[PDB]
Enzyme design. Structure first.
Site, PDB file in Angstrom:
ATOM      1  CG  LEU A  16      -1.564  -0.876   1.690  1.00  0.00           C
ATOM      2  CD1 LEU A  16      -3.198  -0.861   2.396  1.00  0.00           C
ATOM      3  CD2 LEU A  16      -3.152  -1.032  -0.177  1.00  0.00           C
ATOM      4  N   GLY A  22       9.865   2.641   7.652  1.00  0.00           N
ATOM      5  CA  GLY A  22       8.193   1.478   7.730  1.00  0.00           C
ATOM      6  C   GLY A  22       7.656   0.910   5.948  1.00  0.00           C
ATOM      7  CG  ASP A 134       4.241  13.539   7.723  1.00  0.00           C
ATOM      8  OD1 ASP A 134       4.673  14.254   6.516  1.00  0.00           O
ATOM      9  OD2 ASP A 134       4.806  11.804   7.338  1.00  0.00           O
TER      10      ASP A 134
HETATM   11  C1  LIG Z   1       0.305   7.230   4.252  1.00  0.00           C
HETATM   12  C2  LIG Z   1       1.391   6.296   4.838  1.00  0.00           C
HETATM   13  C3  LIG Z   1       2.213   6.770   4.921  1.00  0.00           C
HETATM   14  C4  LIG Z   1       2.933   5.917   4.894  1.00  0.00           C
HETATM   15  C5  LIG Z   1       3.355   4.846   4.663  1.00  0.00           C
HETATM   16 CL1  LIG Z   1       4.634   3.424   5.471  1.00  0.00          CL
HETATM   17  C6  LIG Z   1       2.404   3.816   4.198  1.00  0.00           C
HETATM   18  C7  LIG Z   1       1.026   4.950   4.472  1.00  0.00           C
HETATM   19  N1  LIG Z   1      -0.082   4.174   3.888  1.00  0.00           N
HETATM   20  C8  LIG Z   1      -0.989   3.758   4.810  1.00  0.00           C
HETATM   21  C9  LIG Z   1      -2.204   3.143   3.843  1.00  0.00           C
HETATM   22  C10 LIG Z   1      -3.297   2.684   3.680  1.00  0.00           C
HETATM   23  N2  LIG Z   1      -4.615   2.463   3.008  1.00  0.00           N
HETATM   24  C11 LIG Z   1      -5.921   1.733   2.959  1.00  0.00           C
HETATM   25  N3  LIG Z   1      -5.809   1.501   4.788  1.00  0.00           N
HETATM   26  N4  LIG Z   1      -4.482   2.203   5.764  1.00  0.00           N
HETATM   27  C12 LIG Z   1      -5.126   1.877   6.768  1.00  0.00           C
HETATM   28  C13 LIG Z   1      -3.451   2.116   7.761  1.00  0.00           C
HETATM   29  C14 LIG Z   1      -2.864   2.468   6.659  1.00  0.00           C
HETATM   30  C15 LIG Z   1      -4.102   2.368   6.042  1.00  0.00           C
HETATM   31  C16 LIG Z   1      -1.578   3.810   2.093  1.00  0.00           C
HETATM   32  C17 LIG Z   1      -0.566   4.753   2.589  1.00  0.00           C
HETATM   33  C18 LIG Z   1       0.784   4.823   1.306  1.00  0.00           C
HETATM   34  N5  LIG Z   1       1.694   4.892   1.521  1.00  0.00           N
HETATM   35  O1  LIG Z   1      -0.393   5.118  -0.098  1.00  0.00           O
END
Ligand SMILES: Cc1ccc(Cl)cc1-n1cc(-c2ncnn3cccc23)cc1C(N)=O
Length: 289
Positions: A16, A22, A134
């Site tokens: 994702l 992370g 952030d």
């Molecule tokens: C927002 C974000 C920041 C850092 C990281 Cl490593 C991942 C995410 N992230 C988290 C998500 C996400 N998608 C769907 N469900 N969900 C639940 C918690 C985080 C998510 C998608 C992303 C992305 N980078 O596109």
């Protein structure tokens, strides 16, 4: 015990996103092994070094302590001592991606629903004395057409008991195009620097994430595209100290531009509170409806 998830039952479905230390994956929690189990989001560390594991365990306690309609829901943890954070999966992805895909098909009334929801998750966050650091549409997630949630807390800090700012002595990842002046010059973060970043989110929303109009593209143009590395931060500080600011997005309502610019006050004390921002945005929504 439903908040304990067995590692061996989490099936990888899809990646994702990733940043810095992370990543987040979509997994099925499928202990019946018949592909019927719950789909969940799982955050884990990419370099699960000692110091990062300790930071990540505090990030997990941060998220577990938050219960709000516009903050992504903690579900549990997975222990292998590596740690996976288990969360609800929000299926419309990040608000940056969503808006870019649907761009103008989302109208001003809808953008302000999102803005109000964002503002309310932040206001709640600040009542626990947490500073996000952030706040950007890439860290906001879309549950459905009517609900967004703040969806990552990887930079979040807890204020000291006796102070209204947290000073970061050795900064890592730094989304400097979203940063308040004091955060650039002295690495000081506070509710007021989160409010500054929120004016940048409002900008992002009203530019429909047009790439040639993103905060990095626009700030780089103002300081000159020849600036590189630490000179960017030098010239960005000079620019902001001289009232250089992101431009009014094309077709932006006046009242919405006034709010961004008020969040971008150099004087920390003159930035609005998230409580007054939610009041104001929901007033604007009402006027428009
Ligand atoms: C927002 C974000 C920041 C850092 C990281 Cl490593 C991942 C995410 N992230 C988290 C998500 C996400 N998608 C769907 N469900 N969900 C639940 C918690 C985080 C998510 C998608 C992303 C992305 N980078 O596109």
């Amino acid at each position: 015990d439903p908040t304990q998830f067995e590692e061996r039952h989490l099936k990888f479905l899809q990646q994702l996103g990733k940043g810095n230390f992370g990543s987040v994956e979509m997994c099925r929690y499928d202990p019946l092994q018949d592909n019927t189990g719950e789909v969940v989001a799982v955050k884990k560390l990419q370099h699960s070094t000692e110091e990062h594991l300790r930071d990540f365990e505090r990030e997990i306690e941060i998220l577990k302590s938050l219960q709000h309609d516009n903050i992504v829901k903690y579900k549990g943890v997975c222990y292998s001592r590596n740690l996976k954070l288990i969360m609800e999966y929000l299926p419309y992805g990040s608000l940056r991606d969503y808006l870019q895909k649907h761009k103008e098909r989302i109208d001003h009334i809808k953008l302000l629903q999102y803005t109000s929801q964002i503002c309310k998750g932040m206001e709640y966050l600040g009542t626990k004395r947490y500073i996000h650091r952030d706040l950007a549409t890439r860290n906001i997630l879309v549950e459905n057409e009517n609900r967004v949630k703040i969806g990552d807390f990887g930079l979040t800090k807890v204020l000291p008991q006796d102070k209204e700012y947290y000073k970061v002595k050795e900064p890592g990842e730094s989304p400097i195009f979203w940063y308040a002046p004091e955060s650039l010059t002295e690495s000081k973060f506070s509710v007021a620097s989160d409010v500054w970043s929120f004016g940048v989110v409002l900008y992002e929303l009203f530019t429909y994430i047009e790439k040639s109009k993103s905060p990095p593209a626009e700030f780089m143009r103002m300081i000159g595209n020849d600036k590189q590395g630490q000179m960017i931060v030098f010239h960005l500080i000079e620019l902001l100290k001289n009232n250089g600011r992101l431009p009014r997005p094309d077709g932006c309502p006046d009242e919405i531009y006034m709010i961004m610019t008020e969040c971008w006050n150099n004087n920390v004390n003159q930035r609005p509170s998230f409580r007054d921002l939610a009041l104001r945005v929901d007033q604007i929504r009402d006027n428009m409806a």
